Every structure is written in structure tokens, then in C-alpha cells.
Design a binder for this molecule. Structure first.
Ligand SMILES: [Cl-]
Ligand SMILES: [Cl-]
Length: 294
């Protein structure tokens, strides 16, 4: 079950399963911006990450003194969303808890995602609502993989991420053991002011989680390639770059994060887990982004 939206410039395909964007096409030349899910490198396209990003310590966590199991990448991506408010250029997907999610995460919730194509590209609005009486801690991320050109030898063809604004040098969360965090924030191999060259040398050591929350726009581009994209992500405190390690995948993921993978060690209380947001009963958090399609 899939839904398409479109306007004069663009078409998008979104799976009801995980409200997962799977395709985003420039109609003028039929260019595909989003990874096609070739299992040679990675069999997904752009999952939603909720209520956890990344891996959990010993695949579990705490709520105060109680322990629960948690799957890597959360579980929203594993269940269908209902479709509503469908027009030619926009659509809304909504997921609630189920008996399975309640075993991992004992909260009633609503996760709503609205996609809309505009002249600029694709707008995405998220609303996370705590439908429980208990205080609900969560993380929310989006994990799109974008097609990129490669050199004769399979290296990335001179792609950089350019960011703005930047009020201090670019920093990343330290990783160890991949893909968990080690707890530090550190300098990034090869960063030059607001420009980060995206190389296998950089990415082979695992995901690069930018710590600079002031960033409003992040552009993935190469001077040798016509198409680029820019992520408008002021609402998302962190931004992660990833490509399959020690492989020559023809994609780079640029992933808005409202949360962080666990710091290595013992299972973490989600009420104090770095990057988590705790919602009061009945409260909601809203986050927006845009993928500008150039
Ligand atoms: Cl070349
Ligand atoms: Cl490279």
C-alpha cells in the first residue's frame, strides 16, 4: 500500500508502512533524489525513527526503575500509518500504539506526519502527541538516503555538506562502539569552516552526528553534479551523515535527528537520556522540515 502526491515539478511515493518516503522525482528529467533500496547496499529508503534513534544498550532501556526492550531504529517504521486529508499534492499519515508497541513502550501515542510538495520541494510536518496519563519520553528522527554520483574508482564525487549558520567550529558526537555514542563531542576529520567534505575516509568509521544545533540549512552538493538538495532543519537539534561502512554505496544519508543513539554502557533511563524529550500527559511536540529539491 503506497500513496503518491505530485505537483507540476515533483512526484513523491510514500509507503503506508512506516509512512516511509520511498521515491522523490524531478519530473523535468525524471531524476530520482531518494535511494531506490537496492539490497546490494541498503534495502530501505527513508525510514522514520520513533521513539528511539539508533541502537539501545543491550536492546533495552529504563523508565525509572523498570526495564523494557527496545528495537534498533525504534518501531514506528515497523507498522502501518492510516491515510487522511489526501489531496493531489499533500497527504497525512497517522500511527497510534498497538499491543506489540505497548510491550516495548508502555504509552498511548499519536505520531502524525504530513507530506506536501511545493515549488521548492517536499515539506514534512511531524506531531508527536502523548495520549497517556504517564509522562512520555521519546526521540524522533528521519533517515533519508540520497543518491550521489561516484568517481571512476567508486569514491564519492566531490560531495560536501555545507551548513548555515554556524556559531562555532563543526563538532560531532564521538562514536564507540559503532553505532553507539562514546559520550564526547569532538572535531570532525576534514571540516573547513562551514563545509564538510563527505568521503569514505570520513564515513567508514560510522555515522557522523553533527552537534551544532544552530544550523538552519544543510546542503548536499557536488560541483560536478546538477542536482543537489538542501535540508531546512532548524527544528531538529542534530543532523547525521551516513553511508554503508567499507562499501562503495552510490548514496549518502543526511538525517535530521530530534534525539541521539544511546551512550554506551548500562541501560539508560529514558527520562534522562540525552536528546530525549519528555511530554506531559496530553502534550504534543511539533517539528517541521523541508527538503529543497535543486
Ligand atoms: Cl573520475
Ligand atoms: Cl570518497
Amino acid at each position: 500500500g503506497m500513496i503518491t502526491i505530485e505537483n507540476s515539478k515533483f512526484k513523491a511515493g510514500i509507503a503506508e508502512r512506516g509512512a516511509e518516503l520511498q521515491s522523490l522525482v524531478n519530473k523535468a528529467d525524471n531524476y530520482e533524489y531518494v535511494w531506490t533500496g537496492d539490497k546490494t547496499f541498503w534495502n530501505r529508503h527513508a525510514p522514520i525513527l520513533f521513539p528511539s534513534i539508533g541502537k539501545s544498550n543491550q536492546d533495552q532501556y529504563r523508565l525509572g526503575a523498570k526495564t523494557y526492550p527496545m528495537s534498533q531504529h525504534g518501531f514506528a517504521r515497523d507498522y502501518d500509518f492510516d491515510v487522511s486529508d489526501k489531496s493531489d499534492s499533500a497527504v497525512t499519515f497517522t500511527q497510534h500504539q498497538n499491543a506489540e508497541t505497548l510491550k516495548k513502550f508502555p504509552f498511548e501515542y499519536t505520531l502524525a506526519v504530513t507530506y506536501m510538495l511545493t515549488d521548492g520541494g517536499l515539506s514534512v510536518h511531524y506531531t508527536v502527541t502523548n495520549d497517556d496519563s504517564k509522562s512520555m519520553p521519546f526521540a524522533l528522527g528521519f533517515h533519508p538516503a540520497f543518491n550521489v554520483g561516484l568517481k571512476a574508482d567508486g569514491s564519492f564525487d566531490d560531495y560536501d555538506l555545507t551548513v548555515e549558520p554556524l556559531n562555532s567550529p563543526l563538532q560531532r558526537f564521538g562514536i564507540g562502539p559503532v553505532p553507539f555514542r562514546n559520550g564526547d563531542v569532538e572535531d570532525i576529520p576534514g571540516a573547513e569552516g562551514n563545509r564538510l567534505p563527505l568521503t569514505h575516509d570520513l564515513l567508514d568509521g560510522g555515522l557522523v552526528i553533527l552537534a551544532n544545533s544552530e544550523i538552519a540549512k544543510a546542503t548536499l552538493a557536488s560541483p560536478h553534479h546538477d542536482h543537489s538538495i538542501t535540508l531546512d532543519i532548524s527544528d531538529f537539534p542534530y543532523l547525521t551523515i551516513w553511508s554503508p561502512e567499507h562499501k562503495k554505496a552510490p548514496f549518502i544519508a543526511v538525517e535530521p535527528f530530534d534525539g541521539l543513539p544511546d551512550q554506551a554502557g548500562e541501560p539508560t533511563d529514558w527520562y534522562t537520556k540525552l536528546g530525549n524529550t519528555t511530554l506531559s500527559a496530553g502534550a504534543n511536540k511539533q517539528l517541521a522540515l523541508k527538503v529543497e529539491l535543486h
